[PDB]
Amino acid sequence: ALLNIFDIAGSALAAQSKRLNVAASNLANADSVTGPDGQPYRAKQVVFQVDAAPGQATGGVKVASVIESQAPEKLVYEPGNPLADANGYVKMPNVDVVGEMVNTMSASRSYQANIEVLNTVKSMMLKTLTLGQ
Amino acid sequence: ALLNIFDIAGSALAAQSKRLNVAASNLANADSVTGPDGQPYRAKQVVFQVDAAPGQATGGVKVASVIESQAPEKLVYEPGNPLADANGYVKMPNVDVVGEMVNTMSASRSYQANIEVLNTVKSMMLKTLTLGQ
Amino acid sequence: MDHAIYTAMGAASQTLNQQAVTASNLANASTPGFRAQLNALRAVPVDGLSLATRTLVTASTPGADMTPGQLDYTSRPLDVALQQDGWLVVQAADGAEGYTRNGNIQVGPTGQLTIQGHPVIGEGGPITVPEGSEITIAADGTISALNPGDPPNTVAPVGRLKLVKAEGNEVQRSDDGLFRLTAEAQAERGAVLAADPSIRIMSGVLEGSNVKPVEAMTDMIANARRFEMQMKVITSVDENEGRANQLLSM
Amino acid sequence: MSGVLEGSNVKPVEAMTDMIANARRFEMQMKVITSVDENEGRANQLLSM
Amino acid sequence: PGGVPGALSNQPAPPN
Amino acid sequence: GVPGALSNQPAPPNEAPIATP
Amino acid sequence: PGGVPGALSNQPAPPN
Amino acid sequence: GVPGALSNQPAPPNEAPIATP
Amino acid sequence: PGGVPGALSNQPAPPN
Amino acid sequence: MISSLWIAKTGLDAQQTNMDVIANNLANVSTNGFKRQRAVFEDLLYQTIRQP
């Protein structure tokens, strides 16, 4: 596939892009009352883990799955809402706004670091081809 | 292994990062009332020393240890607090918020300066590699 | 990244949690018989190798405030207020026994006494009053019922309200707002609290909420300043990393 | 009931709170947009050589 | 071997 | 060992207790 | 040799 | 279907329906 | 084939 | 809805409702056989984030 460091850094870039996408989706839908099924929007989170199957300890990053948070959803009192339960409570997303903002910034920073890694590896591989003129 | 200025600037970056982390910890828990064992949160500081190795007072910085400020903890009046002493006084952290902000700014600028030093030395030795073209 | 951002971020999020607790306390500034929630930050130090430099912060609600609130004089014989350190006993939502301070006792058409819709617990199980009868509550909880039409000589006791004594360190606010005995306190005092004969109630006065306004104001000011501080660091770390990523170049 | 007129039922507290939330939600969206735009530049520079 | 990379793994939680 | 060096054994697990037992 | 860097070593202190 | 791999069959068309049906 | 690129396509629309 | 702009909005609405009750009581002073209203408030379900 992508040689070696190429594959590692590309996997890292894809994973961090997925994480930033999840953070942006959480930030956008912080005030959503419902979804298509009538269920509240639950904050999504990616799961990062290494991928070093052929007998290695280090192989990069891959996103195993996207999981919805189990933190208790926020209950707001609204008896006129069609989605209200028997007690008149409506469930609202458990998004942590500051957490998602910090996630956006950190994902951008590590994405940029991996960009710098891949660019440097390319440079070094470009010089290698001139070994002994 | 890291060679010369690379070692020096790496040590400086690591110690400035430690200083900023300690400052952030002090500034975050400037209002914490209790620790996990019931003792108050005493402000932490870093201790800087000169790597030196054995005979070279010309090295980077190294954080010898994280000390805990022995300045007397602030006392507030709360006889209903379980943590109050026999006189009804609860201990509160001795964090100086302005000092922590200034320390964060200082660790930041010093970190940036050492990054610039490292980049310049890296470029210098990369150009040294082509001596005699 | 430098995980220093994950410390200031936690400090900024727990500040919003504290603000949500304080705003909830302020919303209930008129709730009859309300016990304000106490909020406190606690520092947890991350254990492991190397300079113990990271100490995160996590909010904490150490029980509630048991200081008695205002006593409003409403000339109603059913609204009662308790002596300090006292509690009324009602039947909880799940058929259990819970404690409260709201003395707004109401009489249903069938004659059963209720508080906030929960049945009131009398010396022997819920209290049922003769239908459509005037009720007077004594200082020690005795209930006198006058049947309309019959002369005032008919006034006779019916049942006694269960009044218990519990401090702040023994009770915990359940999810429905009703206080219940904590585990350690329950293990020593038994499952059900025995009525204290020394407790005195006052009829015709309703206890308000004990939400102190000056402490709330000061807490909101401090929370805003702390959030802005943590936000400064969150910006310092960002720029520092942005620049540090350049070393990876060439 | 004759002799009285029914006005509007717009709640001012709800509207003011909603406007504040809207403004302070947009700003965050504008921050994320700026972050993605800044990110794409490097990635584009990766295509050199 | 891994978990949620961010807010949901860098906040204190009660034990299991 | 000193921070940033190489060791022969893994670092111990990292845990932050909210309340000590 | 050295000491606390920054706040605790840049304020006037009583002799000791 | 590992992401980033190559498959003979084309990807199914994605859809974002606002209500349920 | 293809349609309007950008804002108009990446916006939820009534089913039709 | 940051959980602090909703909680305070709820309190504002409760105080407005209490003021409406008070204004109704004051406007109906001159009526015959009018029984005054009194507003009663209760806190909703408290959410538990982490057990003691």
Map C165-181 to HEC letters. ECCHHHEEECCCCCEEE
- How many CB atoms are located within 10 Å of the residue A10 CB? 17
DSSP-derived 3-state class of residue C207: strand
Partners of A1 in beta bridges:
none
Question: Counting every residue, how long is chain J?
Answer: 52
Among the listed residues C186, C183, C129, the one whose alpha carbon sits nearest the alpha carbon of residue C160: C129
Lookup: tokens for D21? 């939330």
Strands C163-165 vs C171-173: parallel, antiparallel or unpaired: unpaired
Q: What are phi and psi of H15, to 5 degrees?
A: -145, 145
**In this complex, which of C13, C242, C248 lies closest to A98 when CB atoms are compared?**
C13
Overall resolution, Å? 4.1
Residue of A nearest to D47 (CA): A119
**A38 with H20: Cβ contact below 8 A:** yes
**B36 with F4: Cβ contact below 8 A:** no
User: Chain C residues with CB inside 8 Å of J40's CB?
Assistant: 32, 104
- Shortest CA gap F20–chain C (Å): 10
Lookup: tokens for C226? 């702390």
- Shortest CA gap D15–chain A (Å): 15
User: Chain B residues with CB inside 8 Å of C236's CB?
Assistant: 20, 104-105, 108
Question: Counting every residue, how long is chain E?
Answer: 16
Q: What CA–CA distance (Å, rounded) separates B37 from C44?
A: 10
Chain E touched by F17 (CB under 8 Å): yes
- Tell me the HSE value of B92 on the side-chain side, using a 13 A CA sphere: 14
Q: What CA–CA distance (Å, rounded) separates D22 from D6?
A: 30
User: Chain E residues with CB inside 8 Å of A103's CB?
Assistant: 6-7
Partners of C90 in beta bridges:
C98, C120
Chain centroid to CA C205: how far? 20
Among the listed residues B69, B75, B68, the one whose alpha carbon sits nearest the alpha carbon of residue B92: B75
Chains with 3 or more CB pairs closer than 8 angstroms to I? H
Phi-psi sector, C213: left (phi>0), alpha (psi -120 to 50), beta? alpha
- Residue pair C103/C206 in contact by the 8 Å Cβ criterion: yes
Lookup: tokens for C112? 């059963």
Place of tokens 């909830």: C24
**In this complex, which of D32, D39, D49 lies closest to A122 when CB atoms are compared?**
D49
Interface of D with A in 1-49 (CB under 8 A): 21, 25, 28-29, 31-32, 35-36, 38-39, 42-43, 45-46, 48-49
- How many CB atoms are located within 10 Å of the residue A48 CB? 21
- Tell me the HSE value of G10 on the side-chain side, using a 13 A CA sphere: 10
Residue of C nearest to A97 (CA): C13
Among the listed residues C221, D23, C22, J3, the one whose alpha carbon sits nearest the alpha carbon of residue A99: J3
**H18 with A14: Cβ contact below 8 A:** no
- Shortest CA gap B15–chain G (Å): 11
- How many CB atoms are located within 10 Å of the residue H21 CB? 5
Q: What CA–CA distance (Å, rounded) separates A62 from A17?
A: 11
Q: What CA–CA distance (Å, rounded) separates C234 from C226?
A: 12
Lookup: tokens for C117? 């819709």
Q: Give the 3-state DSSP-derived string for chain D, with helices as H, strands as E and coil as C.
A: CCCCCCCCCCCHHHHHHHHHHHHHHHHHHHHHHHHHHHHHHHHHHCCCC
Fill in the amino acid letter for C44: V
- Residue pair G4/B15 in contact by the 8 Å Cβ criterion: no
What separation, in Å, do the N-terminal and C-terminal C-alpha atoms of chain E show?
17
- How many CB atoms are located within 10 Å of the residue B11 CB? 21
